[PDB]
């Protein structure tokens, strides 16, 4: 039996257009641990996203944070794209600055 990822997309600091920041995609509650996460800028994969070391919660489910430097503007779209053994199609979660 398997557990599908929870996904949150958000910034380290409150978003200020033209101000440097971090874009975070936090994946949690998944099992087993193999997972593929991309951060997307305008639908295209950002290179050299870093991530935290694999760990897990008290319910044994895993969690990872993927992050990269970005500078928010009003017209750029940011997203996080997750695939996992439980998902048939890659799941896409858009960044929303008040979420």
């Amino acid at each position: 039996i398997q557990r599908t990822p929870k996904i949150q997309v958000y910034s380290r600091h409150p978003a200020e257009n033209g101000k440097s920041n971090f874009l975070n995609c936090y994946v949690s509650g998944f099992h087993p641990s193999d997972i593929e996460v991309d951060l997307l800028k305008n639908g295209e994969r950002i290179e050299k996203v870093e991530h935290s070391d694999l760990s897990f919660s008290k319910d044994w489910s895993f969690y990872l944070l993927y992050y990269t430097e970005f500078t928010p503007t009003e017209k750029d779209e940011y997203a996080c794209r997750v695939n996992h053994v439980t998902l048939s199609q890659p799941k896409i979660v858009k960044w929303d600055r008040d979420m």
Binding site: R12, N24, H31, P32, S33, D53, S55, S61, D98
Partner: protein
């Protein structure tokens, strides 16, 4: 404040793709400070918090030896557990272990923990007496009998009551500026109409440490559990965490809703309302 230390082991088989990977990470409360990964080009224990860098070279070599030997041992364990369940050699499987000690606000041992899981279900756990085991199934009874034969719980106990507590206290002293600093949540309430007659109130807590926090919505002083949307507490990447809770309310009733926030960082709970 109270404190704890935990190591988290994950051993993952992957038939046809080499030998099983072993990863260990160490935490003090919500702060990771160490990592080891058998998949590293040059596998060795690595610092992940500045306050652990002052440990000497013998500290790092000691850790590294422990972890390399565990790597081999968990590979044997995966072999065994596959047999215990009559599983084929085709699948990937995972053993997880989390163990550590809890200290009270006095620096005293509260209790130890030593729990393992197989493919994400409880497998075997050391009881709070640090002397007896709980097996989840007839497979884990094999492990239990084998650990009882070799008096494994005695080893676990000596560590959990002894070195675990000693090093935790040493880490808490060395990283006291951060490990023993609670940063209170920065809060605010947002308002967003969903229709002509309803609107969303979202209560925000940002920049807090540690992760543990309570965020609730009340209507006329009463808990709005079932009606509250509540995201998982999330790391910001600067050591701090974030959370929010949201409620859809009848427009014009907004002032009848209060957000309540509890966190170790603040002396008394906050009560907040949307401020237009």
């Amino acid at each position: 404040g109270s404190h704890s230390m935990r190591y988290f082991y994950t051993a993952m088989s992957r038939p046809g793709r080499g030998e099983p990977r072993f990863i260990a990470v160490g935490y003090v409360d919500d702060t990771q400070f160490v990592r080891f990964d058998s998949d590293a080009a040059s596998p060795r224990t690595e610092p992940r918090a500045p306050w652990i860098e002052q440990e000497g070279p013998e500290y790092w070599d000691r850790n590294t030896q422990i972890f390399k030997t565990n790597t081999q041992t968990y590979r044997e364990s995966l072999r065994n557990l596959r047999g215990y369940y009559n599983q084929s050699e085709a699948g990937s499987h995972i053993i997880q272990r989390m163990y550590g000690c809890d200290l009270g606000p006095d620096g005293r041992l509260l209790r130890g923990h030593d729990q393992s899981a197989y493919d994400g279900k409880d497998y075997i756990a050391l009881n709070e007496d640090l002397s007896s085991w709980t097996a989840a199934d007839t497979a884990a009874q094999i492990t239990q009998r084998k650990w009882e034969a070799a008096r494994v719980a005695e080893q676990r106990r000596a560590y959990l009551e002894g070195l675990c507590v000693e090093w935790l206290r040493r880490y808490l002293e060395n990283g006291k500026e951060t490990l023993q600093r609670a940063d209170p949540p920065k809060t605010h309430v947002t308002h967003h109409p969903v229709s002509d007659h309803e609107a969303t109130l979202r209560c925000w807590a940002l920049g807090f440490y540690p992760a543990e926090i309570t965020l609730t919505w009340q209507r006329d002083g009463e808990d709005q559990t079932q009606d509250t949307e509540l995201v998982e507490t999330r790391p910001a990447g600067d050591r701090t965490f974030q959370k929010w809770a949201a409620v859809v309310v009848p427009s014009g009733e907004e002032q009848r809703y209060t957000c309540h926030v509890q966190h170790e960082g603040l002396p008394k709970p906050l009560t907040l309302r949307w401020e237009p």
